[PDB]
Design a protein around this nucleic acid. Sequence first.
RNA 1: CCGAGGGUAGGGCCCGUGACUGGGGCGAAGUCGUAACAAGGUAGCUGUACCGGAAGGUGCGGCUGGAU
RNA 2: AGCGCCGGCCAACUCCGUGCCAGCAGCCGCGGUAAUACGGAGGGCGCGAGCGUUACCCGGAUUCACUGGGCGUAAAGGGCGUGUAGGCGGCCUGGGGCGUCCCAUGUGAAAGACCACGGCUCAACCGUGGGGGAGCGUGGGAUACGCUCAGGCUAGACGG
RNA 3: UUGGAGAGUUUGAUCCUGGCUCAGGGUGAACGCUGGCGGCGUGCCUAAGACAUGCAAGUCGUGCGGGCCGCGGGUCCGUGGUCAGCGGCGGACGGGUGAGUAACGCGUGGGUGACCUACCCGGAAGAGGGGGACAACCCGGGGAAACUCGGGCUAAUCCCCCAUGUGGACCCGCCCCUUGGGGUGUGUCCAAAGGGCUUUGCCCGCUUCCGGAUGGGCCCGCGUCCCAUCAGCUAGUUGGUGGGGUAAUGGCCCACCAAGGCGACGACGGGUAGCCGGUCUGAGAGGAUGGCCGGCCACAGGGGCACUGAGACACGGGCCCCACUCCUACGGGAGGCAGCAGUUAGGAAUCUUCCGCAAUGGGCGCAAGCCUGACGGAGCGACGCCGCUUG
RNA 4: CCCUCGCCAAGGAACUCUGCAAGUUGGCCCCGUAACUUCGGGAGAAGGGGUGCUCCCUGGGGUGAUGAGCCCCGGGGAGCC
Lengths: 99, 82, 96, 7, 122
Amino acid sequence: PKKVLTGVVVSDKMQKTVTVLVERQFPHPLYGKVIKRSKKYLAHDPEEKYKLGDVVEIIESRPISKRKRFRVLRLVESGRMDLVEKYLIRRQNYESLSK
Amino acid sequence: MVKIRLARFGSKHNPHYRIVVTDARRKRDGKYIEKIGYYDPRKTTPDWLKVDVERARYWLSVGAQPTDTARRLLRQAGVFRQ
Amino acid sequence: RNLSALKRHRQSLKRRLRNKAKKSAIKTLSKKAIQLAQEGKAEEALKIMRKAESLIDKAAKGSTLHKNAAARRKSRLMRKVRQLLEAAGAPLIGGG
Amino acid sequence: AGXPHKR
Amino acid sequence: MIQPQTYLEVADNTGARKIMCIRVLKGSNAKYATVGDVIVASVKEAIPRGAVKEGDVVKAVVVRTKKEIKRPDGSAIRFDDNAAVIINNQLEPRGTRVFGPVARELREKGFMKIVSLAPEVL
RNA sequence: CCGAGGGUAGGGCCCGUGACUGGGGCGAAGUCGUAACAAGGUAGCUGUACCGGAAGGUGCGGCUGGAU
RNA sequence: AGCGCCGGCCAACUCCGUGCCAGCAGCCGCGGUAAUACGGAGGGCGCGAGCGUUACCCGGAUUCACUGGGCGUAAAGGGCGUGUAGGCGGCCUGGGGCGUCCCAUGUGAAAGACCACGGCUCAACCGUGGGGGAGCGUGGGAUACGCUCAGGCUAGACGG
RNA sequence: UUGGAGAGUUUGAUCCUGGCUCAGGGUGAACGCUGGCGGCGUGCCUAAGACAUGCAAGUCGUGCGGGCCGCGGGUCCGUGGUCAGCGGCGGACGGGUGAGUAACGCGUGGGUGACCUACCCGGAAGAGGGGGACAACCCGGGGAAACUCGGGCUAAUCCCCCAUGUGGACCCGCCCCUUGGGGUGUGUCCAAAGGGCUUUGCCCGCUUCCGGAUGGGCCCGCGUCCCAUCAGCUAGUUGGUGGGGUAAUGGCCCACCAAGGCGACGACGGGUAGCCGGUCUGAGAGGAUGGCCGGCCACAGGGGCACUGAGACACGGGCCCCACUCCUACGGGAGGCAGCAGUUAGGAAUCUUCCGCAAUGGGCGCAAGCCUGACGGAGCGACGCCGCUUG
RNA sequence: CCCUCGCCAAGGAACUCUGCAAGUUGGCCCCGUAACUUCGGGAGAAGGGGUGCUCCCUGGGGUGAUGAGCCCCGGGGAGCC
Ligand SMILES: [Mg+2]
Ligand SMILES: [Mg+2]
Ligand SMILES: [Mg+2]
Ligand SMILES: [Mg+2]
Ligand SMILES: [Mg+2]
Ligand SMILES: [Mg+2]
Ligand SMILES: [Mg+2]
Ligand SMILES: [Mg+2]
Ligand SMILES: [Mg+2]
Ligand SMILES: [Mg+2]
Ligand SMILES: [Mg+2]
Ligand SMILES: [Mg+2]
Ligand SMILES: [Mg+2]
Ligand SMILES: [Mg+2]
Ligand SMILES: [Mg+2]
Ligand SMILES: [Mg+2]
Ligand SMILES: [Mg+2]
Ligand SMILES: [Mg+2]
Ligand SMILES: [Mg+2]
Ligand SMILES: [Mg+2]
Ligand SMILES: [Mg+2]
Ligand SMILES: [Mg+2]
Ligand SMILES: [Mg+2]
Ligand SMILES: [Mg+2]
Ligand SMILES: [Mg+2]
Ligand SMILES: [Mg+2]
Ligand SMILES: [Mg+2]
Ligand SMILES: [Mg+2]
Ligand SMILES: [Mg+2]
Ligand SMILES: [Mg+2]
Ligand SMILES: [Mg+2]
Ligand SMILES: [Mg+2]
Ligand SMILES: [Mg+2]
Ligand SMILES: [Mg+2]
Ligand SMILES: [Mg+2]
Ligand SMILES: [Mg+2]
Ligand SMILES: [Mg+2]
Ligand SMILES: [Mg+2]
Ligand SMILES: [Mg+2]
Ligand SMILES: [Mg+2]
Ligand SMILES: [Mg+2]
Ligand SMILES: [Mg+2]
Ligand SMILES: [Mg+2]
Ligand SMILES: [Mg+2]
Ligand SMILES: [Mg+2]
Ligand SMILES: [Mg+2]
Ligand SMILES: [Mg+2]
Ligand SMILES: [Mg+2]
Ligand SMILES: [Mg+2]
Ligand SMILES: [Mg+2]
Ligand SMILES: [Mg+2]
Ligand SMILES: [Mg+2]
Ligand SMILES: [Mg+2]
Ligand SMILES: [Mg+2]
Ligand SMILES: [Mg+2]
Ligand SMILES: [Mg+2]
Ligand SMILES: [Mg+2]
Ligand SMILES: [Mg+2]
Ligand SMILES: [Mg+2]
Ligand SMILES: [Mg+2]
Ligand SMILES: [Mg+2]
Ligand SMILES: [Mg+2]
Ligand SMILES: [Mg+2]
Ligand SMILES: [Mg+2]
Ligand SMILES: [Mg+2]
Ligand SMILES: [Mg+2]
Ligand SMILES: [Mg+2]
Ligand SMILES: [Mg+2]
Ligand SMILES: [Mg+2]
Ligand SMILES: [Mg+2]
Ligand SMILES: [Mg+2]
Ligand SMILES: [Mg+2]
Ligand SMILES: [Mg+2]
Ligand SMILES: [Mg+2]
Ligand SMILES: [Mg+2]
Ligand SMILES: [Mg+2]
Ligand SMILES: [Mg+2]
Ligand SMILES: [Mg+2]
Ligand SMILES: [Mg+2]
Ligand SMILES: [Mg+2]
Ligand SMILES: [Mg+2]
Ligand SMILES: [Mg+2]
Ligand SMILES: [Mg+2]
Ligand SMILES: [Mg+2]
Ligand SMILES: [Mg+2]
Ligand SMILES: [Mg+2]
Ligand SMILES: [Mg+2]
Ligand SMILES: [Mg+2]
Ligand SMILES: [Mg+2]
Ligand SMILES: [Mg+2]
Ligand SMILES: [Mg+2]
Ligand SMILES: [Mg+2]
Ligand SMILES: [Mg+2]
Ligand SMILES: [Mg+2]
Ligand SMILES: [Mg+2]
Ligand SMILES: [Mg+2]
Ligand SMILES: [Mg+2]
Ligand SMILES: [Mg+2]
Ligand SMILES: [Mg+2]
Ligand SMILES: [Mg+2]
Ligand SMILES: [Mg+2]
Ligand SMILES: [Mg+2]
Ligand SMILES: [Mg+2]
Ligand SMILES: [Mg+2]
Ligand SMILES: [Mg+2]
Ligand SMILES: [Mg+2]
Ligand SMILES: [Mg+2]
Ligand SMILES: [Mg+2]
Ligand SMILES: [Mg+2]
Ligand SMILES: [Mg+2]
Ligand SMILES: [Mg+2]
Ligand SMILES: [Mg+2]
Ligand SMILES: [Mg+2]
Ligand SMILES: [Mg+2]
Ligand SMILES: [Mg+2]
Ligand SMILES: [Mg+2]
Ligand SMILES: [Mg+2]
Ligand SMILES: [Mg+2]
Ligand SMILES: [Mg+2]
Ligand SMILES: [Mg+2]
Ligand SMILES: [Mg+2]
Ligand SMILES: [Mg+2]
Ligand SMILES: [Mg+2]
Ligand SMILES: [Mg+2]
Ligand SMILES: [Mg+2]
Ligand SMILES: [Mg+2]
Ligand SMILES: [Mg+2]
Ligand SMILES: [Mg+2]
Ligand SMILES: [Mg+2]
Ligand SMILES: [Mg+2]
Ligand SMILES: [Mg+2]
Ligand SMILES: [Mg+2]
Ligand SMILES: [Mg+2]
Ligand SMILES: [Mg+2]
Ligand SMILES: [Mg+2]
Ligand SMILES: [Mg+2]
Ligand SMILES: [Mg+2]
Ligand SMILES: [Mg+2]
Ligand SMILES: [Mg+2]
Ligand SMILES: [Mg+2]
Ligand SMILES: [Mg+2]
Ligand SMILES: [Mg+2]
Ligand SMILES: [Mg+2]
Ligand SMILES: [Mg+2]
Ligand SMILES: [Mg+2]
Ligand SMILES: [Mg+2]
Ligand SMILES: [Mg+2]
Ligand SMILES: [Mg+2]
Ligand SMILES: [Mg+2]
Ligand SMILES: [Mg+2]
Ligand SMILES: [Mg+2]
Ligand SMILES: [Mg+2]
Ligand SMILES: [Mg+2]
Ligand SMILES: [Mg+2]
Ligand SMILES: [Mg+2]
Ligand SMILES: [Mg+2]
Ligand SMILES: [Mg+2]
Ligand SMILES: [Mg+2]
Ligand SMILES: [Mg+2]
Ligand SMILES: [Mg+2]
Ligand SMILES: [Mg+2]
Ligand SMILES: [Mg+2]
Ligand SMILES: [Mg+2]
Ligand SMILES: [Mg+2]
Ligand SMILES: [Mg+2]
Ligand SMILES: [Mg+2]
Ligand SMILES: [Mg+2]
Ligand SMILES: [Mg+2]
Ligand SMILES: [Mg+2]
Ligand SMILES: [Mg+2]
Ligand SMILES: [Mg+2]
Ligand SMILES: [Mg+2]
Ligand SMILES: [Mg+2]
Ligand SMILES: [Mg+2]
Ligand SMILES: [Mg+2]
Ligand SMILES: [Mg+2]
Ligand SMILES: [Mg+2]
Ligand SMILES: [Mg+2]
């Protein structure tokens, strides 16, 4: 089955493309604790109907471009800009990490 | 073509073949597709030959080709009995 | 120091020229037809386009073109001719 | 490596 | 017409690239060296890990010149550079290859090895 | 058009090596003094600063891991 | 029939030679004129067409500690706040089912390993059969705990 | 529940902490002293340094025409060979190596409505008429050679046109489906090749199409070392449109437009490394390792390139550049052991220029058969394990 | 012969106290630019590419009117010697 993921939209700034931020949980193989890990997927939005804060599902599909390998499958939630802020604050904290 | 042949196992001076289906371009003792029986040419045990016969006919039906000395060990196991 | 590789090399050259000549014509008549399709020149375009199509599939008989290559090249040829003639007049003859 | 060089 | 201070390309694989003539080995006071004349040279540019290195004082034979050399038959020949081949005290080349054409004047002057290794003898 | 690579010019990283120079470690029986361990004969340690052949000394502040 | 070894660890001791020499040595250490520790000899211990040595890997090493360690003085608490990400988070009710748990099912090649039997006189080697997991795909189920969503509380916290 | 031992050494002595050290098992080993036999294994870990000589891929006369040669005669056929040529198929397998690669490379599970598959199998349909070229051969220069140029003849399963259209391909319609999947209608386009016998028929072959099977390509999730004393990286970069290209998706490639893409969940950079089944150790958890065997990847003196083709950007095929070596009659030409042996260099160190296609397997062939350094065996070496002797 | 000037084969500082003198370089546009630094600089570092003419398409400005004309700053494409 084509893999189906769920994540928010952290970028709408491309033509016919949105960035979907999927996260997953798993126990540490050695230290057992359940840890979080996230990953951005460049998803296909050909109708340009999806926007920031939208929690959506993406489906594995044939390549639209380089790097673009998933299609947005369906909306799930909307207006989750609270998650988008978490992403942006982190990327923002990187300026305080240089030298 | 897909074939049906003998993949010599055993040890030096101790031949022990597996009648097996594999690609003709695969190496002799290489990764086969399915095992359809074994064959001890030296006859050192009561049952030195054994063929599934049901499976040996499936691959035969779909286009597998036996070897010349593999065709015999399927004949001698009555794979061709009409 | 020898081989039948020498022979297989001689043959490769003969078929190289045989393949190149066919693809040259396939490119020539296709552009020729597409050029008329832009002018349209509707009848003359389609009359050429057939000779293109004929030579294309005539290549997929041997080792010059793969079937899906001929199909792909035919698909884009007729696809381009119609859209050019739609900026002009009736197709008149055939191939559509 | 012209032509003389600097190094 | 090579003289002290003249730079020359080395037409061999000795590792040298450019040598500067410091002497024309031709009698007491030869003003110039042409094709077939031996020179003494400093090695001004070499590639790493060669038979010769920068700063070596080597001997070489001029194998072609930008000054045209004249021939008894009324013809002349000229090259686009001054090239030489690094040799030893027995006039033998110190490398295994020579690059580019050389002037046939080398043959009559006693450099049979170089002439053979030459891709063209003009 | 692209193109192996060759060439010109200028950067970055790494390795080797260098007159000389800096301390470091180690080395049975060298020279100088005796700073520390006892209140070690000026309680010690301390951050800093300055000085002195050398340990060290002294100033300012801190600590007791200081005797009585 | 050879090779190592016989101070302790570590199984195997006496004589002579040597006198901080010559030498031994994996660690602790032996040798300065009575050395089971150096060298030879006799004897003794251990292996045996091998026996030792060097190099390297895991073990002992719970000495990178998930199983399974610590930080007053042994090495180890940041000079002290404030706070970003993150990690973690009180009592009750319900929705979902992500973690988590269960069942079924697909995959998990052969070889190898393991058990059984058998073939080379045994064995090594080799043949035949048996037993499977974890992980991931799918389908079904459970909802205590963790998660999320929704609603309520006042014991934490903040305020008057 | 088949599984867990510890000791020496800091002190006058003690407890603790803590490092060092030892007893165990392991090896593609090497070195010393020593050495009898057999079996099964196993053996360049360094210079992916350099290589003398033979060999490692050919086959089909049941596709074609010849030169030669013997066999039965009339220089006519047939015939046997034999040699190249044309034409098939194979040479993309198998064999070697571990340099590169920290990557969708590998592993594991998946996607392909985005795809291909020679020979094999199964079902459907068909093979009807014409024409043509190039080698071999004949003639002429050149060369030490490698060797090639020119002109002229000719056959075929070699090339081309026409016809036939079960079918298939393409554009545009509508239908079902739902990413390019399966239909259908008009127009348009595409097939073929013959040979051998025992001859109102078989056999090997040919042609278009559908399906199977097998082998592949491509894509995605998760996993996959060290350094943060590498903290910022990015212009085809990230997305879009159009187009090219391919079997096929894609910035894979080009034009243009947009300003995006990635990074402390470690981007970028540096170092090291082929990955896995497994192997070694360990009570396990873990650690270490990936030689031999099996799977995948990568490379073929160093690079770039395409051709032929079902399939290669091809180890023993081709082109070009570079480095090196070579023969030469000095005018000019050749080579690529990380195939099997073998040489040399390096190193502490690693084998026979052996036998055979009898077996298994592979290529070709109607078959006989031919080729097969794959393979099966023999050889050297206490390298290892096992068995045996010196009573 | 002197002055001022032009050119020169091969070499290219060998001249000489000294590259003295004379060559070289040279405007503009674009790319690009190191040590070090007092963070301004070093910098025109260095180094490189472009530069004419013709045709075609096109962006903005001043004037005027918002248009033509005139004037200013540009962009892309194809060519010619
Ligand atoms: Mg044997
Ligand atoms: Mg294969
Ligand atoms: Mg043309
Ligand atoms: Mg085709
Ligand atoms: Mg050179
Ligand atoms: Mg050098
Ligand atoms: Mg120098
Ligand atoms: Mg030379
Ligand atoms: Mg040259
Ligand atoms: Mg010559
Ligand atoms: Mg270029
Ligand atoms: Mg380039
Ligand atoms: Mg370059
Ligand atoms: Mg070049
Ligand atoms: Mg540099
Ligand atoms: Mg010093
Ligand atoms: Mg004294
Ligand atoms: Mg004192
Ligand atoms: Mg005092
Ligand atoms: Mg005092
Ligand atoms: Mg004092
Ligand atoms: Mg003080
Ligand atoms: Mg004082
Ligand atoms: Mg004080
Ligand atoms: Mg204080
Ligand atoms: Mg006090
Ligand atoms: Mg012992
Ligand atoms: Mg004792
Ligand atoms: Mg012991
Ligand atoms: Mg004892
Ligand atoms: Mg004495
Ligand atoms: Mg003595
Ligand atoms: Mg001792
Ligand atoms: Mg030891
Ligand atoms: Mg005595
Ligand atoms: Mg004594
Ligand atoms: Mg004593
Ligand atoms: Mg003793
Ligand atoms: Mg001892
Ligand atoms: Mg003794
Ligand atoms: Mg033994
Ligand atoms: Mg040993
Ligand atoms: Mg143990
Ligand atoms: Mg451990
Ligand atoms: Mg250890
Ligand atoms: Mg440690
Ligand atoms: Mg430690
Ligand atoms: Mg713990
Ligand atoms: Mg501890
Ligand atoms: Mg504190
Ligand atoms: Mg601080
Ligand atoms: Mg927080
Ligand atoms: Mg939480
Ligand atoms: Mg809770
Ligand atoms: Mg769940
Ligand atoms: Mg298995
Ligand atoms: Mg069992
Ligand atoms: Mg298991
Ligand atoms: Mg599962
Ligand atoms: Mg489910
Ligand atoms: Mg123990
Ligand atoms: Mg102890
Ligand atoms: Mg001690
Ligand atoms: Mg102490
Ligand atoms: Mg003591
Ligand atoms: Mg005490
Ligand atoms: Mg005492
Ligand atoms: Mg103790
Ligand atoms: Mg300890
Ligand atoms: Mg201890
Ligand atoms: Mg050991
Ligand atoms: Mg030995
Ligand atoms: Mg063996
Ligand atoms: Mg053996
Ligand atoms: Mg070697
Ligand atoms: Mg190894
Ligand atoms: Mg190697
Ligand atoms: Mg070397
Ligand atoms: Mg060499
Ligand atoms: Mg042979
Ligand atoms: Mg034919
Ligand atoms: Mg022939
Ligand atoms: Mg292979
Ligand atoms: Mg092998
Ligand atoms: Mg080998
Ligand atoms: Mg191998
Ligand atoms: Mg590798
Ligand atoms: Mg890297
Ligand atoms: Mg990295
Ligand atoms: Mg990956
Ligand atoms: Mg994968
Ligand atoms: Mg996979
Ligand atoms: Mg083929
Ligand atoms: Mg066939
Ligand atoms: Mg004909
Ligand atoms: Mg004809
Ligand atoms: Mg001809
Ligand atoms: Mg010639
Ligand atoms: Mg001739
Ligand atoms: Mg001709
Ligand atoms: Mg219809
Ligand atoms: Mg037709
Ligand atoms: Mg026909
Ligand atoms: Mg992929
Ligand atoms: Mg990954
Ligand atoms: Mg597109
Ligand atoms: Mg790209
Ligand atoms: Mg572009
Ligand atoms: Mg742009
Ligand atoms: Mg991440
Ligand atoms: Mg590297
Ligand atoms: Mg390595
Ligand atoms: Mg590597
Ligand atoms: Mg352990
Ligand atoms: Mg075990
Ligand atoms: Mg590993
Ligand atoms: Mg391997
Ligand atoms: Mg081997
Ligand atoms: Mg392997
Ligand atoms: Mg390469
Ligand atoms: Mg090599
Ligand atoms: Mg090459
Ligand atoms: Mg290469
Ligand atoms: Mg082709
Ligand atoms: Mg390749
Ligand atoms: Mg090949
Ligand atoms: Mg190639
Ligand atoms: Mg080769
Ligand atoms: Mg050539
Ligand atoms: Mg000649
Ligand atoms: Mg030549
Ligand atoms: Mg020539
Ligand atoms: Mg030539
Ligand atoms: Mg060549
Ligand atoms: Mg070649
Ligand atoms: Mg070899
Ligand atoms: Mg060898
Ligand atoms: Mg050697
Ligand atoms: Mg050596
Ligand atoms: Mg061997
Ligand atoms: Mg055979
Ligand atoms: Mg086989
Ligand atoms: Mg066979
Ligand atoms: Mg056959
Ligand atoms: Mg042969
Ligand atoms: Mg042989
Ligand atoms: Mg063998
Ligand atoms: Mg050996
Ligand atoms: Mg043995
Ligand atoms: Mg003039
Ligand atoms: Mg001049
Ligand atoms: Mg000049
Ligand atoms: Mg100069
Ligand atoms: Mg110059
Ligand atoms: Mg000067
Ligand atoms: Mg003068
Ligand atoms: Mg002078
Ligand atoms: Mg001077
Ligand atoms: Mg002056
Ligand atoms: Mg001046
Ligand atoms: Mg000037
Ligand atoms: Mg000027
Ligand atoms: Mg000037
Ligand atoms: Mg600089
Ligand atoms: Mg400077
Ligand atoms: Mg600055
Ligand atoms: Mg600046
Ligand atoms: Mg300066
Ligand atoms: Mg400036
Ligand atoms: Mg400039
Ligand atoms: Mg500037
Ligand atoms: Mg310029
Ligand atoms: Mg003009
Ligand atoms: Mg304008
Ligand atoms: Mg205007
Ligand atoms: Mg005005
Ligand atoms: Mg106005
Ligand atoms: Mg105006």
